[PDB]
Design an enzyme around this catalytic site. Structure first.
Site, PDB file in Angstrom:
ATOM      1  N   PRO A 110       0.612  -1.323  -0.119  1.00  0.00           N
ATOM      2  CA  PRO A 110       0.477  -0.071   0.032  1.00  0.00           C
ATOM      3  C   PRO A 110       0.564   1.272  -0.088  1.00  0.00           C
ATOM      4  CG  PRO A 110       0.677  -1.284   2.158  1.00  0.00           C
ATOM      5  CD  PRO A 110       0.459  -1.968   1.435  1.00  0.00           C
ATOM      6  N   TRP A 156       6.427   1.600   2.182  1.00  0.00           N
ATOM      7  CA  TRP A 156       8.038   1.500   1.475  1.00  0.00           C
ATOM      8  C   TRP A 156       7.824   3.092   0.626  1.00  0.00           C
ATOM      9  CZ3 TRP A 156      12.205  -2.319   1.261  1.00  0.00           C
ATOM     10  CH2 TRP A 156      12.217  -3.230   1.832  1.00  0.00           C
ATOM     11  N   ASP A 200       2.786  -2.728  -8.533  1.00  0.00           N
ATOM     12  CA  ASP A 200       2.533  -3.931  -7.929  1.00  0.00           C
ATOM     13  C   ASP A 200       1.447  -4.296  -8.664  1.00  0.00           C
ATOM     14  OD1 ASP A 200       2.605  -5.514  -5.527  1.00  0.00           O
ATOM     15  OD2 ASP A 200       1.109  -4.570  -4.429  1.00  0.00           O
ATOM     16  N   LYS A 215      13.631  -9.121  -0.342  1.00  0.00           N
ATOM     17  CA  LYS A 215      13.055  -9.734   0.712  1.00  0.00           C
ATOM     18  C   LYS A 215      13.335 -11.356   0.555  1.00  0.00           C
ATOM     19  CE  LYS A 215       8.367 -10.592   3.186  1.00  0.00           C
ATOM     20  NZ  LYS A 215       8.611 -12.629   2.919  1.00  0.00           N
TER      21      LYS A 215
HETATM   22  N1  LIG Z   1       5.599  -9.784 -10.048  1.00  0.00           N
HETATM   23  C1  LIG Z   1       5.523  -9.616  -8.876  1.00  0.00           C
HETATM   24  N2  LIG Z   1       5.509  -7.916  -9.137  1.00  0.00           N
HETATM   25  C2  LIG Z   1       4.828  -7.044  -8.481  1.00  0.00           C
HETATM   26  N3  LIG Z   1       3.998  -7.299  -7.496  1.00  0.00           N
HETATM   27  C3  LIG Z   1       3.655  -9.238  -7.334  1.00  0.00           C
HETATM   28  C4  LIG Z   1       4.654  -9.583  -8.047  1.00  0.00           C
HETATM   29  N4  LIG Z   1       4.440 -11.047  -7.207  1.00  0.00           N
HETATM   30  C5  LIG Z   1       3.088 -10.902  -6.228  1.00  0.00           C
HETATM   31  N5  LIG Z   1       3.007  -9.214  -6.051  1.00  0.00           N
HETATM   32  C6  LIG Z   1       2.080  -8.244  -5.029  1.00  0.00           C
HETATM   33  O1  LIG Z   1       3.150  -8.146  -4.261  1.00  0.00           O
HETATM   34  C7  LIG Z   1       2.481  -7.796  -3.165  1.00  0.00           C
HETATM   35  C8  LIG Z   1       3.449  -7.972  -1.366  1.00  0.00           C
HETATM   36  S1  LIG Z   1       4.512  -6.264  -1.835  1.00  0.00           S
HETATM   37  C9  LIG Z   1       3.713  -5.426  -0.083  1.00  0.00           C
HETATM   38  C10 LIG Z   1       5.050  -5.390   0.719  1.00  0.00           C
HETATM   39  C11 LIG Z   1       4.424  -4.444   1.960  1.00  0.00           C
HETATM   40  N6  LIG Z   1       2.748  -4.682   2.541  1.00  0.00           N
HETATM   41  C12 LIG Z   1       4.777  -2.853   2.071  1.00  0.00           C
HETATM   42  O2  LIG Z   1       4.707  -2.246   2.738  1.00  0.00           O
HETATM   43  O3  LIG Z   1       4.414  -2.438   0.831  1.00  0.00           O
HETATM   44  C13 LIG Z   1       0.968  -8.761  -2.992  1.00  0.00           C
HETATM   45  O4  LIG Z   1      -0.081  -8.703  -2.395  1.00  0.00           O
HETATM   46  C14 LIG Z   1       1.144  -9.589  -4.486  1.00  0.00           C
HETATM   47  O5  LIG Z   1       0.321  -8.844  -5.151  1.00  0.00           O
END
Ligand SMILES: Nc1ncnc2c1ncn2[C@@H]1O[C@H](CSCC[C@H](N)C(=O)O)[C@@H](O)[C@H]1O
Ligand SMILES: Nc1nc2c(ncn2[C@@H]2O[C@H](COP(=O)(O)OP(=O)(O)OP(=O)(O)O)[C@@H](O)[C@H]2O)c(=O)[nH]1
Ligand SMILES: [Mg+2]
Ligand SMILES: [Mg+2]
Ligand SMILES: [Mg+2]
Ligand SMILES: [Mg+2]
Ligand SMILES: [Mg+2]
Ligand SMILES: [Mg+2]
Ligand SMILES: [Mg+2]
Ligand SMILES: [Mg+2]
Ligand SMILES: [Mg+2]
Ligand SMILES: [Mg+2]
Ligand SMILES: [Mg+2]
Ligand SMILES: [Mg+2]
Ligand SMILES: [Mg+2]
Ligand SMILES: [Mg+2]
Ligand SMILES: [Mg+2]
Ligand SMILES: [Mg+2]
Ligand SMILES: [Zn+2]
Lengths: 38, 115, 337, 189, 102
Positions: free
Chosen positions: D33, D36, D62, D144
RNA sequence: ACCUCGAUGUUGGAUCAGGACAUCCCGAUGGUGCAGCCGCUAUUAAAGGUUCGUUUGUUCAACGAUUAAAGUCCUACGUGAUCUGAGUUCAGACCGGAGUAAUCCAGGUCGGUUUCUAUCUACUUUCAAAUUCCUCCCUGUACGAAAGGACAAGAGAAAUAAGGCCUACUUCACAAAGCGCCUUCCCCCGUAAAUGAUAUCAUCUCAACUUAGUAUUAUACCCACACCCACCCAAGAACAGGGUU
RNA sequence: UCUCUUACUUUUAACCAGUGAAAUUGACCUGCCCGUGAAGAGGCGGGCAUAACACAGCAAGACGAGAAGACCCUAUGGAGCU
């Protein structure tokens, strides 16, 4: 049948009765008008 | 009986099943009211970083008398449709698979040996 | 179990156009309480976060066949508010709006989705993010109560759901040209047919079976009049279906003294609606040839319109087969690849 | 303020290493959301809060949708596995390059240790393949990863392309949790 | 081969054409079916390309030409252990003394 | 508010549940903007049922796979003389911060003693009258332009729950057990109808009355009573019970 | 460890024989439901039940037993440290 505390008329065809010790409203033209005393 | 977190053997000519990998395929889930799966039952697999549906074909646990009992847990990879991903089954499959309730005819069609 | 016989005015039920304001689920949330224990009386901040708002999606259903079921305003389910004991709120479930096969979604002058297929989906509104709790904001520095805000109410979007009936072929003609009659002839479909003009207000789809297990859909719309750009008659509102239709059937009655002028009026009005409709490929079909006056005027039709025009009766089912040949041939021509 | 507690993990890593500097281009993957992205923009001054300090740039990609942020642009929905989305990353980043790579993306946890491990590592392999055209020489890379068998495999290829591979397990990250971050500075080749 | 007396393969034009045939065959079956002759079940209605129906002593496979090219059911059943598809795949044996080396 | 609870604290969890209906699923109805299939709303119903993993001490929540459904509560936020002690709590230590210092902190992190021989009350074989999913037939029918897709009646397979059993398989071996085998039976009280007055029509009736509707019950099990030498026992803590031709 | 528990041996146990403690104890001829007591009834009110008497189990109740009292407050009570 819709539960209503006070019963009303929605039509001329609409009629009241006292069945099973409660008031009801029956309607042959529009069966949606049916009501039951609660 | 094949339940959750059981190692299975993919007895197919399918690329996915026969591919060299660091993990043996694992049973994610069993499609039965109780978790235990006998022959003919469908189970979900974790292979090579993906989920795949599979049909149980013979197992180590003793069954009914005249029914055969295998020495490895053999599964055939299937699509959700019911179409097997592989083309051929080298390993023998029990004949009992025929009379059991469900989509077994296609798998019988691609099998060579009945025991 | 029997289907109820329909009134001519079934446009009361059938809806093609609707303005919808969609709003996602609200954040909810908000906890600003404090934990207490027997041995440790102060305990610390204790605020659970709240669940996120549910999204709104216009899932396509085959078995709705009208935009009557959709409402003027949709509000997504809001997420539960955060409680004590650092308990989080459950996110709202997703709200689904079932929409016809031939649907189109337009927001602000331009189309956002054409959900013309089976199973395809569009996100109408994003559910709003759930607000923070008292346990959030706790640091070495704080130990303090801020409940943040409910936070991010659901996204407010005004869009037009617009239904364009999906068929391979449509019919265009003046009132009492026997469009409904012709449909009733070729298909198992039963459109309401009557002598009085301006019938079949609702568009009517019937399909035509063939030997190769393939089906061609033909649409029947209400009668069109010269002008129709000034909303005279029934207007040209119903013409929306024909955009999706691959080709057109120019149904012309021979009862009128000059039937050759009919197609001229039709092409003019189609141009008025949309430029490419006039240039769009078609077939011209004449009706009611059982009448002797039609047989008399046939010669001049041959003079003006030519041999290519196919002449038909609906009531007696004369030369229906040539229509079916022509329907199939046009399909195989420019409805493939 | 921060949309998720994940932002606190980056703060702990940053203070130790000084990974984010003013006027430094940042690519965030799996931004939504946007915790970061929010924490990155403050440090790189992409918002342009500090007049004296140089202004950076942050992009987030994302699958899930994200609210707009000050001094940050987002492209969603997008998947990094898809090469088409890469060209869209290329065009928006100033100077044809991104100096910093942040990879906090993780495919949804199935609840099986083996299956979850394989997808996330292979997702980072895709990132490694797309580094050359995105990552500026001498740039920093942070990803990660869940702990498992092929963790060592990911280390080996990182040591080929980068000068140093630093294994970080932050205090902000749950100690009982198996999530591990690999930092890789001084990009060569 | 303890399966059936007669194996049958038939191809089709489209998915809906296959359903037409399968559903006619089963329908006609019931008409001429003996009282004690057990009822039959069509398989793979959800499937796009492959449909199968089992009778008492007959087994029928309804397919596209696409699936015929990939399954080669006729080859399997005419010549059992001697088909090309069985030849490519080889049985894997564990090493003696049970030591792996790179 | 209160001289009411707690000096072996409290949160969760394990085990075992009792109850309420404001019913999540299964049953019976009314209406529908109920063609059919799904749906939306209301009445009635608590007999039965209501999943397994990952993250976190989790209660929550999120995620994944399911299901018919994965209800909402109350019970000293049920239950610790039935059990854990993971978080928060005493003596030790550290990071960060406050303070001249001793020392402190609603923060983060490591470690840290759970006693009891049951006197009284209560209880220790009451009855199962078994629930559900799926597949096939109808039927691919009615219905429907097509796509799609019923209901009653019936058949087969399973899963669980209860009560048993050992011929096979299995752990084993004069036997005891499950992973194995056998059996498992009544309906619902909301409405749908006639005839017919007050109110000579009509009207299902807190009118007299007539059918769905029995608008209440099963059937089944047990059921004789010497010696109370001693022995034996598929009976058993003791006692008692069965056999001893 | 668990799904999902099972079988046998030893200890214990239960019986016969010998020896023989401890905490505890207002008196007790010591029931169930509902109400009252605001919470909290074996003993109060209204119902219901009910010959007498051992032994074996169980832990829901007896606000069960045992302690150098965990927490909050008070004392013109102490003590250690700065
Ligand atoms: N290859 C990819 N490229 C982009 N987003 C991806 C992906 N594989 C999975 N995701 C998405 O990445 C999300 C986690 S990223 C979120 C990390 C954390 N909540 C933050 O602060 O940003 C998952 O819900 C998934 O749907
Ligand atoms: N003699 C004859 N009359 C016909 C024939 N076909 C149609 N008609 C008549 O013409 C009428 C046409 O009415 P519709 O079919 O409803 O007309 P439409 O072309 O659909 O146009 P609208 O009235 O605007 O809906 C029919 O009701 C018949 O009375 C035909 O082949 N022969
Ligand atoms: Mg509190
Ligand atoms: Mg018409
Ligand atoms: Mg006072
Ligand atoms: Mg007290
Ligand atoms: Mg109720
Ligand atoms: Mg209470
Ligand atoms: Mg207790
Ligand atoms: Mg230790
Ligand atoms: Mg004892
Ligand atoms: Mg003694
Ligand atoms: Mg004592
Ligand atoms: Mg009381
Ligand atoms: Mg007392
Ligand atoms: Mg006793
Ligand atoms: Mg004291
Ligand atoms: Mg003093
Ligand atoms: Zn009426």
């Amino acid at each position: 049948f819709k539960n209503k505390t006070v019963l009303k008329k929605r039509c001329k065809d609409c009629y009241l009765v006292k069945r099973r010790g409660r008031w009801y409203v029956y309607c042959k033209t529009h069966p949606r008008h049916k009501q039951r005393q609660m | 009986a094949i339940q959750k977190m059981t190692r299975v053997r993919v007895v197919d000519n399918s690329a996915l099943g026969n591919s060299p990998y660091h993990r043996a395929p694992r049973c994610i889930h069993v499609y039965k009211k109780n978790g235990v799966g006998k022959v003919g039952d469908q189970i979900l697999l974790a292979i090579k970083g993906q989920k795949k549906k599979a049909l149980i074909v013979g197992h180590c646990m003793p069954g009914p008398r005249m029914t055969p009992r295998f020495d490895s847990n053999n599964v055939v990879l299937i699509e959700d449709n019911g179409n097997p991903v592989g083309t051929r089954i080298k390993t023998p499959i029990p004949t009992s698979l025929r009379k059991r309730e469900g989509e077994y005819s296609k798998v019988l069609a691609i099998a060579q040996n009945f025991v | 179990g029997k289907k109820l016989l329909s009134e001519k005015k079934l446009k009361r039920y059938f809806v093609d156009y609707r303005r919808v304001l969609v709003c996602g689920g609200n954040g909810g949330a908000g906890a600003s309480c404090f934990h207490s224990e027997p041995r440790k009386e102060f305990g610390g901040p204790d605020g659970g976060d709240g669940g996120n708002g549910g999204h709104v999606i216009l899932r396509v259903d085959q078995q709705v066949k009208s935009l009557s079921s959709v409402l003027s305003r949709y509000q997504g389910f809001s997420g539960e508010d955060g409680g004590s004991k650092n308990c989080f709120g459950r996110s709202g479930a997703v709200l689904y709006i079932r929409v016809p096969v031939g649907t189109l979604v337009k927001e602000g002058g331009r189309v956002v989705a054409d959900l013309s297929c089976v199973g395809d989906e569009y996100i109408a509104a994003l559910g709003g993010a759930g607000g923070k709790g008292n346990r959030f904001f706790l640091a070495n520095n704080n130990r303090a109560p801020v409940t943040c805000t409910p936070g991010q109410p659901g996204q407010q979007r005004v869009l037009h759901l617009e239904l364009k009936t999906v068929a391979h072929a449509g019919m265009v003609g003046f009132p009492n040209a026997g469009k409904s009659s012709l449909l009733r002839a070729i298909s198992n479909a039963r459109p309401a047919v009557a002598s009085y003009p301006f019938t079949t207000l609702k568009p009517h789809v019937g399909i035509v079976h063939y030997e190769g297990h393939l089906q061609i859909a033909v649409a029947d719309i209400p009668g069109i009049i010269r002008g129709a750009h000034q909303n005279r008659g029934l207007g040209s509102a119903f013409l929306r279906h024909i955009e999706r239709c691959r080709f057109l059937l120019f149904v012309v009655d021979l009862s009128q003294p000059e039937p050759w002028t009919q197609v001229d009026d039709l092409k003019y009005e189609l141009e008025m609606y949309e430029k490419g409709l006039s240039a769009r490929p078609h077939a011209i079909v004449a009706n009611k040839i059982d009448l002797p006056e039609a047989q008399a005027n046939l010669s001049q039709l041959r003079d003006h319109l030519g041999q290519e025009v196919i002449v038909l009766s609906a009531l007696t089912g004369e030369n229906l087969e040539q229509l079916l040949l022509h329907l199939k041939v046009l399909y195989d021509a420019y409805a493939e690849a | 303020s921060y949309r998720c507690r994940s932002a606190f993990k980056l703060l702990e890593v940053n203070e130790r290493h000084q990974i984010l500097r003013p006027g430094l281009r940042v690519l965030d993957c799996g931004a939504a959301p946007g915790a970061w992205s929010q924490v990155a923009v403050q440090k790189v001054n992409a918002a342009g809060t500090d007049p004296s300090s140089p202004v950076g740039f942050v992009l987030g990609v994302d699958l899930l949708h994200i609210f707009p942020l000050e001094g940050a642009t987002f492209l969603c929905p997008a998947d990094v596995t898809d090469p088409r989305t890469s060209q869209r990353i290329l065009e928006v980043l100033p100077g044809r390059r991104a100096d910093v790579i942040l990879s906090d993306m993780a495919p949804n946890a199935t609840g099986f240790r083996d299956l979850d491990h394989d997808r996330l590592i292979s997702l980072c392999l895709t990132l490694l393949s797309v580094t050359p055209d995105i990552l500026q020489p001498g740039g920093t890379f942070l990803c990660k990863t869940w702990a498992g068998s092929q963790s060592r495999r990911l280390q080996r290829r990182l040591t080929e392309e980068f000068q140093n591979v630093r294994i970080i397990k932050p205090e902000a990250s749950r100690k009982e949790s198996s999530e591990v971050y690999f930092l890789a500075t001084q990009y060569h080749g | 081969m303890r399966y059936t007396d007669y194996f049958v393969i038939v191809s089709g034009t489209s998915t809906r054409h296959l359903h037409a045939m399968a559903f006619y065959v089963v329908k006609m079956y019931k008409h001429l079916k003996c009282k004690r002759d057990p009822h039959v079940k069509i398989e793979g209605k959800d499937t796009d390309d492959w449909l199968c129906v089992d009778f008492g002593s007959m087994v029928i496979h309804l397919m596209l030409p696409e699936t015929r090219e990939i399954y080669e059911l006729e080859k399997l059943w005419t010549l059992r252990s001697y088909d090309d598809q069985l030849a490519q795949i080889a049985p894997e044996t564990v090493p003696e003394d049970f030591i792996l080396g790179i």
